Amino acid sequence: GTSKLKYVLQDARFFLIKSNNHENVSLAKAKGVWSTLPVNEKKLNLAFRSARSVILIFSVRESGKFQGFARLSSESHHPIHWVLPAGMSAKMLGGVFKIDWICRRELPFTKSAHLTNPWNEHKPVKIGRDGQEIELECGTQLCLLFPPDESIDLYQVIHKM
Ligand SMILES: O=C1CC(CN(Cc2ccccc2)C2CC2)=NC(=O)N1
């Protein structure tokens, strides 16, 4: 069903998080961690303190899809073998956020064409810079479009709220 998912998403905040490649999403899915540049680190840390749930919705650049979504379980904290763009050092990252995956299934952008994000001029929700906040209603409907991930049990995540 969808009821535990809706409960986790109640009064949540949502952020569009880009990845430079699939490998970093794979690492994040395996290890339950993510890192960012300091600008988005500050934004996500403020959000983590503000809301019962902060949801990261991931999209690998140029993939035309979202690769899943996860809930922050921690503020950032200060090596993980991330695959970084040429010229970027690990020292340019902020701290590491712990995350609990809610859905590891993909959703193509074609399936979210009917959702617009008020915090990005009501452009389609797939459009946004890395770190763009997605308004509650749009973000909830976007998460509900993903195929159910029957491998995940949200019992444990509800307890962290
Ligand atoms: O475009 C991105 C990609 C990305 C993946 N990073 C490396 C990186 C961080 C910031 C910019 C470019 C690459 C691995 C998880 C530590 N994390 C983001 O937060 N935004």
UniProtKB/Swiss-Prot annotation:
YTH domain location, by residue? Answer: 12-146
Q: What is the effect of changing residue 82 to D?
A: Does not affect ability to influence alternative splice site selection
Effect the entry attributes to changing residue 129 to A = Reduced binding affinity for N6-methyladenosine (m6A)-containing RNAs by 100-fold
Q: Impact of altering residue 92 to A?
A: Reduced binding to N6-methyladenosine (m6A)-containing RNAs
GO term, biological process aspect, one: in utero embryonic development
Q: What is the effect of changing residue 34 to D?
A: Abolishes RNA-binding and ability to influence alternative splice site selection
- Name the coiled-coil region(s): none
Q: Which UniProt keywords apply?
A: Isopeptide bond, mRNA processing, mRNA splicing, Nucleus, Phosphoprotein, RNA-binding, Ubl conjugation
Q: How is it modified after translation?
A: Tyrosine phosphorylated.
Annotated residues for binding of RNA: 18-20, 34-35, 82, 130
Give the Phosphoserine positions (modified residues).
89
The principal localisation class reads: nucleus
Q: What is the effect of changing residue 129 to F?
A: Reduced binding affinity for N6-methyladenosine (m6A)-containing RNAs by 9-fold
GO MF terms on file?
A: mRNA binding; N6-methyladenosine-containing RNA reader activity; RNA binding
Q: Which GO terms describe its cellular component?
A: nuclear speck; nucleoplasm; nucleus; plasma membrane
Where in the cell does this protein reside? Nucleus; Nucleus speckle
**Any notes on this protein's domains?**
The YTH domain mediates RNA-binding.
**Assembly notes:** Interacts with SRSF1. Interacts with SRSF2. Interacts with SRSF3. Interacts with SRSF7. Interacts with SRSF10. Interacts with CPSF6. Interacts with KHDRBS1/SAM68. Interacts with TRA2B. Interacts with KHDRBS3. Interacts with EMD. Interacts with RBMX. Interacts with ZCCHC8.
Role this protein plays: Regulator of alternative splicing that specifically recognizes and binds N6-methyladenosine (m6A)-containing RNAs. M6A is a modification present at internal sites of mRNAs and some non-coding RNAs and plays a role in the efficiency of mRNA splicing, processing and stability. Acts as a key regulator of exon-inclusion or exon-skipping during alternative splicing via interaction with mRNA splicing factors SRSF3 and SRSF10.
Official protein name in the record: YTH domain-containing protein 1
Q: Which organism is it from?
A: Homo sapiens (Human)
Tell which residues of the whole protein are contained here: 345 to 507 of 727
